[PDB]
PDB file of C-alpha atoms and ligand atoms in Angstrom:
ATOM      1  CA  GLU A1166      -0.050  -0.080  -0.025  1.00 28.83           C
ATOM      2  CA  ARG A1167       1.965   2.394   1.474  1.00 27.91           C
ATOM      3  CA  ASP A1168       4.667   4.254  -1.276  1.00 26.98           C
ATOM      4  CA  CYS A1169       7.952   4.554  -0.024  1.00 29.26           C
ATOM      5  CA  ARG A1170       9.648   5.210  -3.563  1.00 28.57           C
ATOM      6  CA  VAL A1171      11.101   8.573  -2.939  1.00 25.04           C
ATOM      7  CA  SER A1172      10.437  10.060  -5.683  1.00 29.05           C
ATOM      8  CA  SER A1173       6.586   9.833  -4.471  1.00 29.18           C
ATOM      9  CA  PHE A1174       7.565  12.236  -1.375  1.00 27.25           C
ATOM     10  CA  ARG A1175       5.469  15.020  -0.856  1.00 28.26           C
ATOM     11  CA  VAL A1176       7.693  18.466   0.043  1.00 29.73           C
ATOM     12  CA  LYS A1177       6.815  21.925   1.518  1.00 27.49           C
ATOM     13  CA  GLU A1178       4.395  23.797  -1.292  1.00 29.62           C
ATOM     14  CA  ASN A1179       5.640  26.783  -2.114  1.00 30.10           C
ATOM     15  CA  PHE A1180       8.523  26.554   0.001  1.00 26.22           C
ATOM     16  CA  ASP A1181       9.661  30.396   1.389  1.00 25.73           C
ATOM     17  CA  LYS A1182      13.604  30.726   2.077  1.00 23.09           C
ATOM     18  CA  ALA A1183      13.597  33.805   3.823  1.00 25.80           C
ATOM     19  CA  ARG A1184      10.970  33.171   5.872  1.00 27.51           C
ATOM     20  CA  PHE A1185      12.799  30.044   6.955  1.00 28.65           C
ATOM     21  CA  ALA A1186      16.149  31.568   7.771  1.00 25.77           C
ATOM     22  CA  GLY A1187      16.828  31.930  12.114  1.00 27.07           C
ATOM     23  CA  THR A1188      17.206  29.416  14.695  1.00 28.03           C
ATOM     24  CA  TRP A1189      16.219  25.932  14.434  1.00 25.69           C
ATOM     25  CA  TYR A1190      16.331  23.790  17.819  1.00 24.42           C
ATOM     26  CA  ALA A1191      16.431  20.164  16.565  1.00 22.78           C
ATOM     27  CA  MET A1192      13.838  18.121  19.218  1.00 24.97           C
ATOM     28  CA  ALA A1193      14.442  14.236  17.512  1.00 25.91           C
ATOM     29  CA  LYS A1194      16.208  12.787  14.723  1.00 27.74           C
ATOM     30  CA  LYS A1195      16.138   9.274  12.534  1.00 30.54           C
ATOM     31  CA  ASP A1196      20.272   8.640  12.038  1.00 34.01           C
ATOM     32  CA  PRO A1197      22.021   7.721   8.551  1.00 33.71           C
ATOM     33  CA  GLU A1198      25.165   5.083   8.771  1.00 34.05           C
ATOM     34  CA  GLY A1199      28.297   6.117  10.384  1.00 35.54           C
ATOM     35  CA  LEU A1200      29.098   9.414  12.084  1.00 33.19           C
ATOM     36  CA  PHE A1201      26.428  11.919  12.660  1.00 35.10           C
ATOM     37  CA  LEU A1202      25.686  14.699  15.431  1.00 33.81           C
ATOM     38  CA  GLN A1203      24.377  13.459  18.589  1.00 32.51           C
ATOM     39  CA  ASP A1204      22.677  16.182  20.801  1.00 28.70           C
ATOM     40  CA  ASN A1205      22.996  19.726  21.687  1.00 33.03           C
ATOM     41  CA  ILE A1206      21.958  20.105  17.886  1.00 35.37           C
ATOM     42  CA  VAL A1207      21.179  23.854  17.436  1.00 32.21           C
ATOM     43  CA  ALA A1208      20.895  24.836  13.395  1.00 33.88           C
ATOM     44  CA  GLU A1209      21.509  28.828  12.254  1.00 34.20           C
ATOM     45  CA  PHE A1210      19.962  29.653   8.614  1.00 34.33           C
ATOM     46  CA  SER A1211      20.321  32.476   6.747  1.00 33.86           C
ATOM     47  CA  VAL A1212      19.622  33.670   3.503  1.00 37.54           C
ATOM     48  CA  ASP A1213      21.511  36.462   1.400  1.00 35.41           C
ATOM     49  CA  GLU A1214      20.146  39.268  -1.283  1.00 38.37           C
ATOM     50  CA  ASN A1215      19.872  37.099  -4.136  1.00 40.43           C
ATOM     51  CA  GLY A1216      18.141  34.299  -2.405  1.00 42.38           C
ATOM     52  CA  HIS A1217      21.041  32.142  -1.386  1.00 41.34           C
ATOM     53  CA  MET A1218      20.674  30.072   1.411  1.00 44.17           C
ATOM     54  CA  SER A1219      23.379  29.054   3.809  1.00 47.51           C
ATOM     55  CA  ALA A1220      23.592  27.794   7.405  1.00 49.31           C
ATOM     56  CA  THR A1221      25.913  26.983  10.649  1.00 48.15           C
ATOM     57  CA  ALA A1222      25.195  24.130  12.956  1.00 47.76           C
ATOM     58  CA  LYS A1223      26.398  23.314  16.341  1.00 46.27           C
ATOM     59  CA  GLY A1224      26.369  19.933  17.994  1.00 44.61           C
ATOM     60  CA  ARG A1225      28.315  17.433  20.326  1.00 40.74           C
ATOM     61  CA  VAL A1226      29.658  14.482  18.016  1.00 41.14           C
ATOM     62  CA  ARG A1227      31.616  11.391  19.125  1.00 40.65           C
ATOM     63  CA  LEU A1228      34.527  10.528  17.160  1.00 38.35           C
ATOM     64  CA  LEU A1229      36.560   7.169  15.839  1.00 39.67           C
ATOM     65  CA  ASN A1230      38.228   6.641  18.951  1.00 40.24           C
ATOM     66  CA  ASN A1231      35.644   8.126  21.567  1.00 42.33           C
ATOM     67  CA  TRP A1232      37.023  11.532  21.808  1.00 41.14           C
ATOM     68  CA  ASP A1233      33.816  13.887  22.388  1.00 40.60           C
ATOM     69  CA  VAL A1234      33.777  17.216  20.602  1.00 42.44           C
ATOM     70  CA  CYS A1235      31.215  20.058  20.052  1.00 44.39           C
ATOM     71  CA  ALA A1236      31.226  20.058  15.965  1.00 43.75           C
ATOM     72  CA  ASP A1237      30.877  23.475  14.205  1.00 43.37           C
ATOM     73  CA  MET A1238      29.291  23.094  11.047  1.00 40.54           C
ATOM     74  CA  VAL A1239      28.745  25.257   7.775  1.00 42.96           C
ATOM     75  CA  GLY A1240      26.394  24.256   4.689  1.00 45.20           C
ATOM     76  CA  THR A1241      25.735  25.920   1.876  1.00 44.76           C
ATOM     77  CA  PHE A1242      22.377  25.281  -0.345  1.00 45.18           C
ATOM     78  CA  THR A1243      22.150  24.998  -3.829  1.00 47.12           C
ATOM     79  CA  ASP A1244      18.445  25.627  -5.308  1.00 47.81           C
ATOM     80  CA  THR A1245      16.975  22.802  -7.888  1.00 47.75           C
ATOM     81  CA  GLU A1246      13.584  22.800 -10.058  1.00 44.20           C
ATOM     82  CA  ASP A1247      11.935  22.338  -6.945  1.00 44.44           C
ATOM     83  CA  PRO A1248      11.521  24.716  -4.519  1.00 46.69           C
ATOM     84  CA  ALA A1249      11.448  22.785  -1.028  1.00 50.28           C
ATOM     85  CA  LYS A1250      14.710  20.449  -2.553  1.00 48.26           C
ATOM     86  CA  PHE A1251      18.324  21.577  -2.413  1.00 52.03           C
ATOM     87  CA  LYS A1252      21.476  20.235  -3.011  1.00 51.21           C
ATOM     88  CA  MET A1253      23.788  21.244   0.676  1.00 52.13           C
ATOM     89  CA  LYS A1254      27.632  21.582   0.697  1.00 50.16           C
ATOM     90  CA  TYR A1255      29.055  20.740   4.257  1.00 47.68           C
ATOM     91  CA  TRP A1256      32.726  21.054   5.753  1.00 46.99           C
ATOM     92  CA  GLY A1257      33.600  21.784   9.501  1.00 46.20           C
ATOM     93  CA  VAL A1258      35.483  24.680  11.251  1.00 48.35           C
ATOM     94  CA  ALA A1259      38.029  22.511  12.447  1.00 47.23           C
ATOM     95  CA  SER A1260      39.898  20.059   9.735  1.00 46.70           C
ATOM     96  CA  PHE A1261      39.139  16.855  11.232  1.00 46.21           C
ATOM     97  CA  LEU A1262      35.022  16.917  10.771  1.00 46.32           C
ATOM     98  CA  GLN A1263      33.311  15.052   7.918  1.00 48.61           C
ATOM     99  CA  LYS A1264      32.842  17.256   4.801  1.00 49.80           C
ATOM    100  CA  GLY A1265      29.860  16.154   1.931  1.00 47.80           C
ATOM    101  CA  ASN A1266      27.408  16.854  -0.363  1.00 51.01           C
ATOM    102  CA  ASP A1267      23.515  15.834   0.554  1.00 51.50           C
ATOM    103  CA  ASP A1268      20.676  15.960  -0.555  1.00 49.62           C
ATOM    104  CA  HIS A1269      18.445  18.788   1.477  1.00 49.42           C
ATOM    105  CA  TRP A1270      14.507  18.698   1.423  1.00 45.76           C
ATOM    106  CA  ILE A1271      11.849  20.464   3.553  1.00 44.97           C
ATOM    107  CA  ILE A1272       8.780  18.205   4.071  1.00 45.27           C
ATOM    108  CA  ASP A1273       6.590  20.353   5.779  1.00 45.38           C
ATOM    109  CA  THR A1274       6.913  23.599   7.899  1.00 47.17           C
ATOM    110  CA  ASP A1275       4.652  25.722   9.428  1.00 51.26           C
ATOM    111  CA  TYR A1276       7.746  28.825   9.822  1.00 49.16           C
ATOM    112  CA  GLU A1277       6.836  29.879  13.265  1.00 49.72           C
ATOM    113  CA  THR A1278       6.516  26.709  15.108  1.00 47.55           C
ATOM    114  CA  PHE A1279       8.237  23.520  13.334  1.00 49.70           C
ATOM    115  CA  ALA A1280      10.133  22.168  10.411  1.00 50.37           C
ATOM    116  CA  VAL A1281      10.678  18.117   9.444  1.00 51.83           C
ATOM    117  CA  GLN A1282      14.019  18.096   7.008  1.00 50.29           C
ATOM    118  CA  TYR A1283      15.228  14.873   5.266  1.00 50.15           C
ATOM    119  CA  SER A1284      17.811  13.673   3.053  1.00 47.86           C
ATOM    120  CA  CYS A1285      18.100  10.515   1.140  1.00 49.79           C
ATOM    121  CA  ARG A1286      22.310   9.561   0.601  1.00 52.26           C
ATOM    122  CA  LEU A1287      21.177   6.259  -1.069  1.00 50.60           C
ATOM    123  CA  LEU A1288      18.697   4.722  -3.207  1.00 53.28           C
ATOM    124  CA  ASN A1289      18.204   1.170  -3.344  1.00 53.16           C
ATOM    125  CA  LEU A1290      16.967  -0.408  -7.231  1.00 53.10           C
ATOM    126  CA  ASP A1291      13.562  -0.163  -6.110  1.00 54.14           C
ATOM    127  CA  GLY A1292      13.333   3.728  -5.588  1.00 53.85           C
ATOM    128  CA  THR A1293      13.074   3.358  -1.877  1.00 58.43           C
ATOM    129  CA  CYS A1294      15.805   4.869   0.213  1.00 57.49           C
ATOM    130  CA  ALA A1295      18.637   2.891   1.765  1.00 57.22           C
ATOM    131  CA  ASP A1296      20.410   4.988   3.848  1.00 59.81           C
ATOM    132  CA  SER A1297      18.317   8.614   5.430  1.00 60.32           C
ATOM    133  CA  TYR A1298      18.274  11.116   7.669  1.00 62.65           C
ATOM    134  CA  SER A1299      15.793  13.337   9.292  1.00 62.07           C
ATOM    135  CA  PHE A1300      15.869  16.276  12.050  1.00 62.84           C
ATOM    136  CA  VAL A1301      12.443  17.662  13.540  1.00 62.36           C
ATOM    137  CA  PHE A1302      13.231  21.292  14.416  1.00 60.32           C
ATOM    138  CA  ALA A1303      11.885  23.535  16.436  1.00 61.97           C
ATOM    139  CA  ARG A1304      11.222  27.401  17.066  1.00 61.85           C
ATOM    140  CA  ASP A1305      10.843  27.149  20.799  1.00 59.47           C
ATOM    141  CA  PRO A1306      12.746  24.423  22.577  1.00 60.49           C
ATOM    142  CA  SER A1307      10.061  21.923  24.313  1.00 61.49           C
ATOM    143  CA  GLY A1308       7.636  19.335  23.789  1.00 61.76           C
ATOM    144  CA  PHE A1309       5.204  21.287  20.697  1.00 60.30           C
ATOM    145  CA  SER A1310       1.556  21.619  21.296  1.00 58.65           C
ATOM    146  CA  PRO A1311       0.040  18.024  20.710  1.00 56.81           C
ATOM    147  CA  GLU A1312      -2.069  19.597  17.360  1.00 57.62           C
ATOM    148  CA  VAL A1313       1.655  19.819  16.086  1.00 60.24           C
ATOM    149  CA  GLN A1314       2.987  16.618  17.204  1.00 60.40           C
ATOM    150  CA  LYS A1315       0.133  14.724  15.332  1.00 60.35           C
ATOM    151  CA  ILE A1316       1.292  16.961  11.998  1.00 59.35           C
ATOM    152  CA  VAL A1317       4.778  15.364  12.376  1.00 60.33           C
ATOM    153  CA  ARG A1318       4.116  12.198  13.086  1.00 60.62           C
ATOM    154  CA  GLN A1319       1.777  11.721  10.146  1.00 63.10           C
ATOM    155  CA  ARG A1320       5.183  13.254   8.422  1.00 62.10           C
ATOM    156  CA  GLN A1321       7.152  10.853   9.730  1.00 59.21           C
ATOM    157  CA  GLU A1322       4.795   8.051   8.196  1.00 62.34           C
ATOM    158  CA  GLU A1323       4.496   9.923   5.292  1.00 62.76           C
ATOM    159  CA  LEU A1324       8.567   9.802   4.593  1.00 64.19           C
ATOM    160  CA  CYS A1325       8.389   5.660   6.056  1.00 65.59           C
ATOM    161  CA  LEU A1326      10.211   6.645   8.780  1.00 60.39           C
ATOM    162  CA  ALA A1327       7.857   6.257  11.471  1.00 62.15           C
ATOM    163  CA  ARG A1328       9.170   5.319  14.816  1.00 60.80           C
ATOM    164  CA  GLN A1329      12.741   5.560  13.845  1.00 58.88           C
ATOM    165  CA  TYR A1330      13.442   8.464  15.397  1.00 59.63           C
ATOM    166  CA  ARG A1331      14.928   9.588  18.982  1.00 60.89           C
ATOM    167  CA  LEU A1332      14.507  12.419  20.852  1.00 60.18           C
ATOM    168  CA  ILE A1333      17.670  14.588  21.584  1.00 63.20           C
ATOM    169  CA  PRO A1334      18.657  16.453  25.232  1.00 64.99           C
ATOM    170  CA  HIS A1335      19.890  19.841  25.239  1.00 65.87           C
ATOM    171  CA  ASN A1336      22.186  20.303  28.610  1.00 65.65           C
ATOM    172  CA  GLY A1337      24.614  23.064  27.407  1.00 66.35           C
ATOM    173  CA  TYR A1338      27.894  20.859  26.487  1.00 67.93           C
ATOM    174  CA  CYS A1339      28.757  23.086  23.351  1.00 69.44           C
ATOM    175  CA  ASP A1340      28.011  26.665  24.962  1.00 72.16           C
TER     176      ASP A1340
HETATM  177  C1  RTL B1781      25.669  21.643   7.607  1.00 73.69           C
HETATM  178  C2  RTL B1781      24.282  21.207   8.431  1.00 73.69           C
HETATM  179  C3  RTL B1781      23.323  20.380   8.721  1.00 73.69           C
HETATM  180  C4  RTL B1781      24.126  19.255   8.830  1.00 73.69           C
HETATM  181  C5  RTL B1781      25.315  18.304   9.341  1.00 73.69           C
HETATM  182  C6  RTL B1781      25.914  17.233   9.192  1.00 73.69           C
HETATM  183  C7  RTL B1781      25.718  16.066   8.605  1.00 73.69           C
HETATM  184  C8  RTL B1781      27.032  17.342  10.247  1.00 73.69           C
HETATM  185  C9  RTL B1781      27.752  16.245  10.422  1.00 73.69           C
HETATM  186  C10 RTL B1781      28.593  15.960  11.399  1.00 73.69           C
HETATM  187  C11 RTL B1781      29.819  15.103  11.304  1.00 73.69           C
HETATM  188  C12 RTL B1781      29.677  13.343  11.216  1.00 73.69           C
HETATM  189  C13 RTL B1781      30.739  15.147  12.477  1.00 73.69           C
HETATM  190  C14 RTL B1781      32.559  14.677  12.799  1.00 73.69           C
HETATM  191  O1  RTL B1781      33.234  14.537  11.576  1.00 73.69           O
HETATM  192  C15 RTL B1781      21.727  20.306   9.119  1.00 73.69           C
HETATM  193  C16 RTL B1781      21.402  19.094   8.357  1.00 73.69           C
HETATM  194  C17 RTL B1781      21.959  20.184  10.424  1.00 73.69           C
HETATM  195  C18 RTL B1781      21.293  21.431   8.844  1.00 73.69           C
HETATM  196  C19 RTL B1781      22.136  22.583   8.652  1.00 73.69           C
HETATM  197  C20 RTL B1781      23.203  22.664   8.286  1.00 73.69           C
END
């Protein structure tokens, strides 16, 4: 029944980059394979005068060898035929942090309260995603109204990611 083909997924209608700017607290995440941000994750989005979107982000990550560090990350986004779908180039302030180029899709947002983000890093032969990640972001660090929670849950189901997220703490560690 459920179509899990990435090419089928709905994204945010008439996505507005400028209204999306500012501070976004990560409340929940679905992990990909390998090294990934762990917790204390906060993003800052910006858009310049020509419509070019970029972001910084902080979060705790534990390395190779179990070393715990505060990652300071940077991303730059390229626009596509769909206003809600981007290519994100990313790197760290420290040279040893992971660098890459990921799809970056805004699945849904009301710009003032929540956002659901998605990235498929690898397609299966059948069109479904072999390696994804997803953030649930909030403007306000706290639990979301029950009304907003219901909508977020539905979006998770539509991405074929329901029941695959974990809650993320904030306790300072990265200042
Ligand atoms: C840049 C960037 C993002 C992704 C960051 C990633 C993927 C970080 C991974 C870091 C690693 C693996 C560090 C250890 O080397 C998100 C989607 C939050 C949006 C804001 C900008």
